[PDB]
Amino acid sequence: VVVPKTRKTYCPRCDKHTPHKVSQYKKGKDSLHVQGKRRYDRKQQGFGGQTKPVFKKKAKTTKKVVLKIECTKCKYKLQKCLKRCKHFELGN
RNA sequence: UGGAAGUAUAAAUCGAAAAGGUGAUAGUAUUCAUCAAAGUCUAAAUAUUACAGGAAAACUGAUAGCAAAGAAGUACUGUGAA
RNA sequence: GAAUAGCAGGAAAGCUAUAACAUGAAGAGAAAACGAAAAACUAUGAGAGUGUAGAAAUACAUUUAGCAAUAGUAUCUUUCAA
RNA sequence: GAUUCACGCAGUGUUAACGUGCAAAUUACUUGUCAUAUUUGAGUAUAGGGGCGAAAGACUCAUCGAACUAUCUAGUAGCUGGUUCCACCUGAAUAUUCCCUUAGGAAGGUCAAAGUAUUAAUAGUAUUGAUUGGUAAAGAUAAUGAUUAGGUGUCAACAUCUUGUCAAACUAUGAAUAAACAAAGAAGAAUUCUCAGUGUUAAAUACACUUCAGGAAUUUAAAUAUAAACAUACUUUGAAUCGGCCAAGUCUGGUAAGCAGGACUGGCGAUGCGGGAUGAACCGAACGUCGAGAUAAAGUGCCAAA
RNA sequence: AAUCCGACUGUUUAAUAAAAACAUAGCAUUCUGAUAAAUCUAAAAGGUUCAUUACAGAAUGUGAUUUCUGCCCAGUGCUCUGAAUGUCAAGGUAAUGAAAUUUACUUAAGCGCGGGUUAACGGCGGGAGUAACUAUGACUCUCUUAAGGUAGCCAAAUGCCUC
RNA sequence: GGGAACGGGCUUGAUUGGAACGGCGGGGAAAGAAGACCCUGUUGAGCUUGACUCUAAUUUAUCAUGUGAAAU
RNA sequence: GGCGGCACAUCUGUUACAAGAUAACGCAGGUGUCCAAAGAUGAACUCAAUGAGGACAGAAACCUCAUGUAGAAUAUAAGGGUAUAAGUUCAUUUGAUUAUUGAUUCCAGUACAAUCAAUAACUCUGAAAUGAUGGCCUAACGAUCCCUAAGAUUUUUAAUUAGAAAGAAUUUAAAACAUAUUAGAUUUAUCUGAUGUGUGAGACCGGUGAUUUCUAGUUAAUCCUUUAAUAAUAAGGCUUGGGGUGUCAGAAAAGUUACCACAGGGAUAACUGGCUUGUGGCAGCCAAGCGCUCAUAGCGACGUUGCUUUUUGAUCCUUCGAUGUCGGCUCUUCCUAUCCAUUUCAAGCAGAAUUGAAAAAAGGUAUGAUUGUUCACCAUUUAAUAGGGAACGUGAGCUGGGU
RNA sequence: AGGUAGAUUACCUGACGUUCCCAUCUGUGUGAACAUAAUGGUACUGAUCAGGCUCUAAGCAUCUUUACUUCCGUGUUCGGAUGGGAACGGGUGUAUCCUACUUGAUAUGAACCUACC
RNA sequence: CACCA
RNA sequence: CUCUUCGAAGAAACCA
């Protein structure tokens, strides 16, 4: 919900408790050269229409929040998942 | 297509060479290996339920075995394919 | 009786072929890279004797053996993980 | 593109005949119509997601909301029907989990057949001992709620002492029936001596685990009842089945139901026999072929043995 | 003697419906200058209307005559002689990199915006006041989306209640 | 009467002489037809539509090198 | 069946039967969230309410004493738990973290998810013992494939120095041409023959030693693969999160058929029959009253007990390889809960006309306008113009008006 | 006898009063520093002037409560079993198990380690 | 607010 | 999900 930045948590690389910078994880841009997309492009060529299922029955109204707790002095990132919340804000 | 950043064919466009192709993960570089496309022919080993001529059978024995053991694709039906 | 090559006999049958390979002898890992002993231990257990007695068969005591199986262990190979 | 009759034609009515017919659409009377948007012969043109239609999804060789014919083709069916000799032995199911699952499947239970092990590997039972539960009951100024009245104190009110009646979603208390242990398996006990490795520990000779670490002597087969060696423990492979129905000194919905759905058991299904006249379930009792005898439920005026 | 439907002559479900159904003349709408419109074909110096030429060809609705066709362009259609940088493709250009690649800029129609159109598909309701006793509302106002059922006609082959 | 709750067969009764002719339409839950109403099936077909996925026709842009100028 | 609802994933009490399991479209409710504090810890305090007091101030404002077992609060539904707390206030903090095991709950003893017990790090709070791997407990949620993020420095190797200890290394037929040198030609991005050499070579004589190992440094490279060798991009691996399937063990999906078709079904509706009888119809018991007086001539409220299957329901037992489904016409028979005629009793029965009741079902119980109607409502006639059953009698008896 | 620590967690609680303090405990005095809050009331620290007034501890009462015992009462209910009776509803007999509320009688704590008296 | 029959 | 305007609209997009 309202979680702050500047967490002081354990860093596996340094084996110590160091200050961390907390942000939110956003899904990166889809690449056009990965195997799954390359395979999909070949399949969609030619006649046949839509060759793969298209999801059209969503039910979830929220998504799980994943923080990116990044070590300040060693750049070691940790991915921590939170419970489902409708409104999430990065505090002070 | 098993060939997966394209294995093969074809169409639209493009289009080489003081040669070059391939080493199946796309890219550039340097080595290595192995071949040298875009013309032609070529016996032998292989297939065969057309058809013809033979020989065999733990095959059937006239409601069986071919649809047909007699003038059987005959008699008979349909405008006709059948 | 892998194709296949020979033998007598004339044979869809029979016999002979130091043989490619198939399954197995070693297992784990996605892969690179690897690749098994403390010549094992503990428990219960199959069998064999000897003596005494009832007295017919058979029952008690003692010495020895420790297979199969089940469980638990030390050790060893591989894996991030047994 | 007036009114009518006739040769012809059609098909309004009888909802007549006929309806295994004269006929896979016909007959009789009645009616309408009977030349210019008329009737009709032959030739010719239009073909199956096509044609043709003054339009009915009508017609396209008795075939039309997509002709006929042959091939793919023995199309697919969780659905329906059938599935072929005898005797003997054993003998079921309707729970649970998942499925685009609900007329069907897979894991699992019941069951059969094969193959084993001397076997810390018997119990749908009772007793004794220590427990667990919150049902039936009971209670109601005992907690939570419901509810009738009467005294006393400062109309009512509020206190306080009685009184009558209550709860599936109230409870102090709390059975009967039940649930899970123990009644001597590191292998049938116990004691004495000796005793090590780790660790706990302030340190240990305490304590914990180590086959009641280990080793050796002495004593020893005892420790509720009952039953159990064709006992007990299974292992592997697999079939069928998961539409169920009935009874009740049981319950929930419903006015109730041969209604709907459950807890425990016994049955029917899969089951004949004796009795209830007859009856899937009730009562007695479960079946190799027979002879004789006592019996069961229930009967003994006749049918009908007594 | 009247009522309903169809104007009339005509056609129709071969074999249960001959009619109020179809057709019809009349009315009206749309597109097209012929190298066109419609439209058959896989293609085609291919084919039909077309031996044709707007008094024509092609595509539709209503259904003789008389009388009348009310209001609405908001939505969906169709159209425009409209605005440019709202959104829109492969491509084209440029930058980086060793190269693939990556990034940026620019591009048509279409939709969106604006206007026209109902004999185009269609729609024609609410709320608040108000007339000298009685209700109503000729007349104001006020949104939802645009308009608020006009001339007529009726328990109708169209009205549940309803005999 | 009970039974699958409407028997020709079973139980208990009523009652019965064998073969039949012309009629008739109560019964044989009479015949004709693997219900056509209803439901089920992960069975179809005709038709409709901004249901999903597509496609012919239509349309728009780029490519496919005629010369000779001129501007952008 | 549809429309409605979700009993489809899921939690609380009760049904539910004092172990476990446990039904219905049973009952009363709940979930798809919320929280940097409402997580962790330490300290202090005690809540609701009542009595008595205190200016405004009143029943509800704030203060004080006394009693005060929680009658308050604890995010939420309900049920559990809680008083030097789990509630209220203050203070510090991020354990709401990393890695590895073994179990328990659903369970097929699968996954997901949840609940725990330990070990190794690094931390928070407290003086300390302890406590902390989210919320006091029971719900608060998610596969394969695909996409998208985070992680794989600890260590293991090669090279060159310094030191040290162990090591003959296999054995006669040769082409690639890097080159040097000439010969024949050419001007071009110039080539074409042949002769030497090394390369490329390998047969050591107890000792040299090629070669491997060890130590200490130093330089480099380091998670695996892209299969002839490397390199920087790119791609694929391995582990763990997120993007979701609510039909919640997880297809990608609009209607209508009255023109319809097939496989089936009494597993299942529309008609009889069968159980029931709420509803309909009919009949009783009691006696508050009405009936000028008078409960009972005739009625009987408030309660209450029955019968029928002539209405409609409720159910789904028989029939889906078919039991012809409304009404009328024609015809026979049956029931009595009697409308008339016959015989009786009673009256608030003077006569007449009526009303209540008993025996009795052998005989009778009509004609028409409207409607397909059953039903109804009218106009008459009659001694009366009663109510019903027979597969809602009766379609190889008719009709076809309705459906 | 008292105080510290407890284990059983009402026979230990609650109300009305009563008895000592000789030690101990408590209440009692003060605010300088540690420390404390709005308040030296709490908590903290320094002390010993006085007091059994409260606490605490011991005892009383036809005391509420609580804990054992009988009785309630083999009454409620219950497991097994009829061709037992009843139209239903419900209720026997047989071989068995057996509460609760209430009322009456009793009790109102037992016990462990250390120090001091 | 009542669909099929 | 992108772009664009004033938590509402417009165009375009769509393999868990």
Tab-separated table of C-alpha atoms (C1' of nucleotides) in Angstrom, chain G residues 39 67 72 84 96 112 114 122 185 191 218 233 250 258 260 278 286 296 340 344 364 372 380-382 386 402:
chain	number	residue	atom	x	y	z
G	39	G	C1'	4.246	-5.935	11.267
G	67	U	C1'	-17.457	-0.267	42.640
G	72	A	C1'	-15.399	-2.460	26.128
G	84	U	C1'	0.517	-5.988	35.185
G	96	A	C1'	6.865	-8.373	5.781
G	112	C	C1'	-1.174	-25.549	-5.617
G	114	A	C1'	-1.767	-23.221	4.085
G	122	C	C1'	22.676	-10.987	9.022
G	185	A	C1'	56.044	-13.396	-70.755
G	191	C	C1'	51.373	-13.639	-63.548
G	218	U	C1'	52.331	-11.910	-10.258
G	233	U	C1'	26.303	-8.125	-30.040
G	250	G	C1'	-7.015	-23.457	-15.843
G	258	A	C1'	-43.397	-22.920	-36.857
G	260	C	C1'	-35.991	-28.198	-39.705
G	278	G	C1'	-52.801	-27.754	1.151
G	286	C	C1'	-68.773	-27.006	21.992
G	296	U	C1'	-80.098	-25.303	19.977
G	340	C	C1'	-89.902	-34.062	-8.611
G	344	U	C1'	-93.051	-40.044	7.567
G	364	G	C1'	-88.392	-38.835	-14.522
G	372	G	C1'	-65.530	-23.913	-30.488
G	380	U	C1'	-89.666	-19.490	-21.839
G	381	U	C1'	-92.010	-24.347	-20.560
G	382	U	C1'	-92.417	-27.940	-16.674
G	386	A	C1'	-80.497	-32.156	-9.090
G	402	G	C1'	-60.993	-24.757	-30.949
